[PDB]
Design an enzyme around this catalytic site. Structure first.
Site, short mmCIF file in Angstrom:
data_model
loop_
_atom_site.label_atom_id
_atom_site.label_comp_id
_atom_site.label_asym_id
_atom_site.label_seq_id
_atom_site.Cartn_x
_atom_site.Cartn_y
_atom_site.Cartn_z
N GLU A 165 24.56 48.74 25.14
CA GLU A 165 23.88 49.86 25.78
C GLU A 165 23.81 49.78 27.31
O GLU A 165 22.72 49.75 27.89
CB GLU A 165 22.46 49.98 25.20
CG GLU A 165 22.45 49.92 23.67
CD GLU A 165 21.07 50.16 23.07
OE1 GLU A 165 20.09 49.58 23.57
OE2 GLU A 165 20.97 50.92 22.08
N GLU A 184 25.26 49.59 15.41
CA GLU A 184 23.84 49.38 15.20
C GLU A 184 23.12 50.69 14.91
O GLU A 184 23.30 51.67 15.64
CB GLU A 184 23.23 48.59 16.37
CG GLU A 184 22.07 49.25 17.09
CD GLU A 184 21.57 48.39 18.25
OE1 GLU A 184 20.42 48.78 18.96
OE2 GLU A 184 22.20 47.36 18.56
C1 LIG Z 1 19.60 48.68 20.11
O1 LIG Z 1 18.25 49.17 19.76
C2 LIG Z 1 17.47 48.25 18.92
C3 LIG Z 1 17.33 46.91 19.71
O2 LIG Z 1 16.59 46.01 18.89
C4 LIG Z 1 18.75 46.36 20.01
O3 LIG Z 1 18.65 45.14 20.75
C5 LIG Z 1 19.49 47.40 20.89
F1 LIG Z 1 20.78 46.95 21.19
#
Ligand SMILES: *[C@H]1OC[C@@H](O)[C@H](O)[C@H]1F
Ligand SMILES: *[C@H]1OC[C@@H](O)[C@H](O)[C@H]1F
Ligand SMILES: *[C@H]1OC[C@@H](O)[C@H](O)[C@H]1F
Ligand SMILES: *[C@H]1OC[C@@H](O)[C@H](O)[C@H]1F
EC number: 3.2.1.37
Lengths: 500, 500, 500, 500
Positions: free
Chosen positions: A160, A277
């Site tokens: 991210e 994810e």
């Molecule tokens: C994506 O959102 C949830 C968080 O726990 C993760 O580390 C992130 F990469």
């Protein structure tokens, strides 16, 4: 209710993209006894091919170091911990969906960190040093496991980068540069190794359009696009937890479908697309994760998700997590499919149930999937998630299922508010934070689906099934061929037993 | 229904004599992988202290052999197999309730044998040689396990000598002689070694009077009286199985009571009384053993049998048996509490449930038992055996249980026609004789009691338990104090989760 | 050579104080799979009762936290990890020799830290909160394991406070206060909880005197005195390792003998003395630990240490350590008795060999120890450490041992530069940092003592043993009675076999 | 001594036909715990593909039964046991080299039996009922294991029919009839199932010329020729054991060669040839089986046998045997590579050592085999069996081996009279028949080869090895490239360690 007559034929296929990958807490935690027992336990029930988590380059794994002598300063790549971590993964039969990051401290250009364990999220002081680290690790992987093996490992660059928390200043261009330098270092080692990104979270898809255009204009290789997906609205943390309204699964499948289109309208139309994810809430302390609702909800995504993506990794497989410090209770809203002490949450069973599905997709709608396996048996899964509170959470079903054979053996598994809901029980116990062994044992006994067997007579190639789905229920029916052997028992007559 | 107000105190105690000893198929079978795995499985669930079975001296175990040097005939005692068997028992944590028998071929006076495996059942051709054999074996147990361990082992002499099938002509006189020589030999190795008998089955208790008086008038050592007990009427075998009407538990109980009385009125009024073998049917092919019925029926015997005997050994712990040849199907009416492939029968859980009983017996009636544990928690066990076809088998219950706390956590376990009934599923599958691994897996999942938990409050020191018991049901209720920690969770509010 | 005639009897005893306790890396590391597998492996060979390590209150274990509600800071005690950590210990059969420390970050007054893992070593910012953290922890332990259990656990306060590294400014005054408060808060929980200190390293023994006088005068409880011992001289670390001259064991024994006198001369003359941490080198990167030398050296201490202390804990049981970062190679001079991948170092077998020791000490000198076990058999351990460089390292022996029986069976076990030296083999392979599975297997096969058996006929109650110890060798001789059965084999004659 | 220069050349390959199959006691023993743990043990050390033993149809396994309903008599095939046995075999990863036989009791035409467990050795009363049995069994195998799996199992018809002991009157013509009926039944089930015979022992190879000629004339299908081979001469049993002179390995190798040539001159010249049973002595009670001699002897067969046959199965893998009644001591001359209590015998290590051979044969003679692996590393095995009494048994060697690398890591393993000779140690204990746990543990510790590592530099592509072979010794040498990493350890210097 819902009357359904399942077609006897179909040209639709159900793949196992849903079980391609599963997420995990940072790699460092993988050195834990609890972590490993739980991973093995999950793999004995769900055949995940990969496992994706952060921390490969973080300092607990401890790869990047620097030895200083009066005369010079030279890097030292220490592999004692990842060798162990990756050795145990391969032993268990699961492969790493490697995520390159975060920034080891001796290479950090800044001091900004993220999470409780403080991974550095700033670019490297010297990109060449970062490039040699990446190559040093890749060559070590090749040396220890062989190139045939490593070539199967996809490498996702960072996490991210669109959020100021994971990438200093959310510097889009510096990210593209990091990607360029890394992709080139990997390719240098071997041109067939798979590299990709941008691993962004929702709400910033202009990043994917830019990312792909950057690789095109700069002639930088890309083998896949990655992105994350969550359906939880903004919430407010307490020092212990947080609650967030989960939007319907429809929003997530739509986000899948939307980004898929962006990739097909781009300069690299056939790139595989991974949702590295996803879950309902993106918080590791949101109670909804431990509930039957979560399991009924995820059911549809495992059902339809694979139509738009190549994979979608559930974050996570275990509560062994730390982004927000060490868990403080048997149930705390962790991302885990399996809570501490290897206590499967209902969501675990949703994945477990899909293990029964075949490739032939005979029927599918927003609350039911029906497939047929190789041998001809038929499996069916239906779910009834309750989005908001109501007085009529029940849903009746009547399905006519096509069956080759005449005699059928039926195996029904079910989970709902009263079955396979260790959470509810833990609530009966007074929500102990640190239960005894006797209490954990009772939680394990409870954390199982209800099993009911039966037998019917398929008539003209069809069997009629009628059932009711309680609140947040998920059910799995399996219809296999019965071959009665009762005639071989000379004198068989149950009526001659007291009361039968 | 059945309304009951359980008292706060009582002058009665509940012993664990019900789990003192369990039965087994011939010892030679203890050499099997299936056997040992299964035994370990039972011991992990029921702390049985001893295990009683035939065949110690039979030739498969091979202790007695004879070497021939010229025209000389020297005896030879081979301990290779018993050592392995007894080594495995002590390792598991269970001791042998030794049964001296049967007759090794080379010592037999006649050719009469019993069972598929043909254990010779004629007296010894030379009681001296028999005596030496007995002494050789004890001195070996002493030499390998130490006198201290062996003193804990009781030694029952022979098996049901009153039946011509188990002792030629049922010669009562020869048995008394057998007993004298054997007991004499044992005592000589060490007079603290417990010896006893007469090991007869019901309907011949005059055998005990004759026995005791035989010892009391011949000064023959005796440390305990043993007898068997069943409630199955004569039946008629088919080449595969046999059905027999089982009579109410009262018959067996009154029988325990009768013989116990025949002793207090004897010359050895304080001798301990051991039921070295009991079950509904005395046949290894009576389907009644695999049913929920059997589970409910034996429940009362566990609840009361302790009142009259020092121990009662359920025959047996496993279906690993060969008296009537190798079993021919997953379920065949074997004695085992556990069917092959370690699939627990419902009767298994009747024993499992009794582990929750405390020593304080607050209340008890023909179908219910309530006890309190050291920590104050209370347990209840009710059973509803339906001993005949009836359009209505259900029973209603309402029990006020005294509790020294207001908040109660409730753990309920239930086995009946639809729960913990692998037999019922086996039939659903078409009664497969040699089930595949998937089927056996399904049987294993079904073979578990229904666990159910809740939490209510006690009013006026009483927790009201309202519940009904279906056909052949057995239920366990453990009431423990709920110490709520819910207040330590900042912001805790489940209503903030979708649907809740 | 060294001719010795072992006295026929004796009145001196050899106690098992040498196996009372063993050291370990920080508790947080006990969460590791590698750690647990290794601890179990050790406990199957050496029955250590307690385990001493730092980090109990360090933030990785995470017990002390603070919740911020509005504007109020509420403390929180999270037991998720120590509960998992202490369960595994108790499950394995070993209890913690608790060491209170270090300073959780939230209560820390300063910012100073020690080690790679940064354990804060400053005093508390509020001694009240410290006391409350202490009682909170103790009560939980009580609640989880019961007072009968937690009573068997000793409590050491802090670690080597006499060193600026572990205690800010090595402030002797503050330590006495922290100890006063801590030793107090513990007692308030229960007056029978053993407490002690000052757990200082050698050289600053004036601390023990000022400690035993502080208690006496300020009326502070004390149940034991703890101190550490090391015979390694100063050295100069390279970024990878350090070499240090090791002084003779005599230096350590004398210190045990010395400090023990200070106690018998103080106000608390009957206090137990615990050497909670010892080894040759006090560095986790001194190759000497991995050597055959380190094993022949420690032999004499296991042999004599017991004469002066109530216990002496070898630091440590395993190379799972991190004080100076993650190890960078299979052999790196770690404190462990067992190298990573469960490869036992030669020192491991020195402890292992001592199990064969009885309590009846018949003889002993600086290089030998002979004891007789209850059953009569005799055991001997002789070691030959090569302190400096010499050209005649070998040592010859001739010992007449008194043997109760006439026929002896001799079991000889030996470790030296050629036997049980995985380090040497590691060198033969090129000192690989990250050995392959095959190399680790070879190291495991090599990591075992040579074993030789034979048989002699004792004459005049004495047996003559002539053996030669090579460089850094440690040998074990067990002499049990030989009861020949050869005669019971009819026709026995090995000469009738080809070539025999 | 012996001086050999291994050519850096290879015109011949060394196959793994030596580990294709291994022998076993009758199938019914595969039900024992001892058996299975041992089979798993052996398989973890030697990748045997198949296992061959008697008793598939014998009555202890009990497949063939007959139910008597009124008058009508119906056969019943009980698979309870083989299902368990073959399930365990496939689970372990070893397939059955099925030996059809012997004659189930109810189908026998005569009363002649063989061995302690009395397997019936007479032809069936009704060949059609026998034919139906064969079919039922095969059809069940297909049903449970699937056709693809069962097609990999070879079917040997009977055992040594040329001997009166295993086949009534050694009726050659009746055996050819038995083979035809069986083979035809097999081919009826599935045309491609592999069937063969005559499974005769040596001395009557004409049975083989007649066999192939019979199949030709009657057009009876045949897929392979089986035969047995032993080199033990006539002996004279004692009630306990037997001694026999073992002839040189040349005799056996020449029998393999003689029979191979016979097949080549038959109607089926390309039929594969299997030695389904071999060893020195053919008696399960001849001590030679347990000596280091046997290990050195068998070494040559493992080395040359694969030259003439497609497989040769060593009888047997374990001492779990009953042909001559239950064993009576830890060592008794059993056929097993492993003695009871999983104590590997020296021969076990001869097979183990061969795992090290590569496919490239560089040199070979009567006492040495040298091969090269795919990675370029070289392995050498040399043996020195002492066929007869001698004062000078040792044999010295100097071998020049070609290696493609300069820095060589050497792993050497050795078994002889002093290393890995449990028999020797057992004798040192007095030849106990029923050793204690302690004694069994000591034997296990002794039951391993001596391992020694080192490192030398080659000179001009060659390394010179100098070693002496003791009496009945077997040595294994593995030479692999040494990749030194020492240069990466900053400041490394072992001399800075006491005594180094
Ligand atoms: C994506 O959102 C949830 C968080 O726990 C993760 O580390 C992130 F990469
Ligand atoms: C008691 O009855 C049941 C039978 O199987 C046993 O052998 C006998 F002793
Ligand atoms: C004692 O010396 C060794 C070091 O590793 C420990 O931390 C210290 F307390
Ligand atoms: C071959 O000779 C050895 C014997 O044990 C086997 O039974 C026979 F087939």
């Amino acid at each position: 209710m819902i009357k359904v007559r399942v077609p006897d034929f179909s040209d639709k296929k159900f793949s196992d993209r849903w079980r391609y990958c599963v997420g995990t807490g940072r790699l460092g935690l993988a050195l834990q006894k609890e972590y490993i027992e739980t991973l093995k336990y999950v793999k004995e029930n769900i055949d995940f091919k990969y496992i994706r988590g952060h921390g490969l380059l973080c300092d607990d794994v401890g790869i990047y170091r620097e030895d200083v002598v009066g005369d010079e300063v030279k890097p030292f790549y220490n592999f004692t911990y990842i060798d162990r971590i990756f050795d145990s993964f391969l032993e268990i039969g699961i492969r790493p969906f490697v995520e390159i990051g975060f920034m080891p401290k001796k290479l950090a250009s800044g001091t900004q960190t993220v999470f409780y364990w403080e991974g550095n999220v700033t670019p490297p002081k010297d990109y060449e040093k970062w490039s040699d680290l990446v190559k040093a690790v890749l060559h070590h992987f090749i040396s220890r496991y062989g190139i045939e093996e490593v070539l199967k490992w996809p490498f996702e660059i960072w996490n991210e980068p669109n959020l100021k928390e994971f990438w200093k200043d959310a510097d889009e261009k510096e990210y593209f540069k990091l990607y360029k330098v890394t992709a080139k270092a990997i390719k240098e080692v071997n041109e067939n190794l798979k590299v990709g990104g941008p691993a962004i979270c929702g709400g910033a898809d202009y990043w994917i359009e830019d990312f792909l255009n950057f690789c095109y204009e700069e002639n930088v290789p890309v083998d896949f696009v990655s992105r994350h997906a969550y359906t939880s609205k903004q919430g407010e943390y307490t020092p212990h937890l947080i609650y967030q309204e989960i939007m319907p699964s429809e929003y997530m499948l739509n986000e899948f479908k939307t980004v898929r289109e962006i990739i097909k309208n781009s300069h690299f139309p056939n790139l595989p697309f991974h949702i590295t994810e996803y879950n309902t809430s993106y918080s590791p302390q949101n109670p909804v994760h431990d509930t039957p609702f979560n399991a009924a909800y995820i059911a549809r995504i495992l059902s339809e998700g694979g139509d738009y993506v190549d994979s979608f990794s559930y974050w996570t497989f275990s509560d062994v997590f730390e982004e927000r410090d060490v868990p403080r209770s048997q149930f705390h809203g962790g991302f885990g499919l399996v809570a501490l002490n290897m206590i499967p949450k209902p969501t675990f069973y949703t994945f477990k149930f899909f293990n029964a599905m075949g490739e032939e997709m005979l029927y599918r709608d927003e609350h039911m999937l029906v497939t047929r396996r190789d041998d001809g048996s038929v499996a069916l899964i239906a779910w009834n998630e309750v989005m908001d509170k109501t007085e009529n959470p029940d849903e009746d079903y009547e399905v006519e299922i096509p069956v080759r054979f005449r005699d059928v053996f039926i195996k029904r598994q079910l989970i709902d508010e009263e079955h396979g809901n260790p959470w509810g029980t833990w609530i009966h116990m007074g929500r102990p934070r640190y239960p005894s062994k006797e209490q954990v044992n009772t939680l394990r006994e409870v954390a199982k689906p209800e099993i009911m067997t039966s037998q019917p007579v398929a008539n003209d190639g069809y069997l009629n099934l009628k059932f009711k789905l309680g609140k947040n229920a998920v059910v799995l029916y399996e219809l296999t061929e019965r071959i009665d052997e009762s005639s071989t028992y000379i004198g068989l007559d149950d009526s001659k037993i007291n009361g039968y």
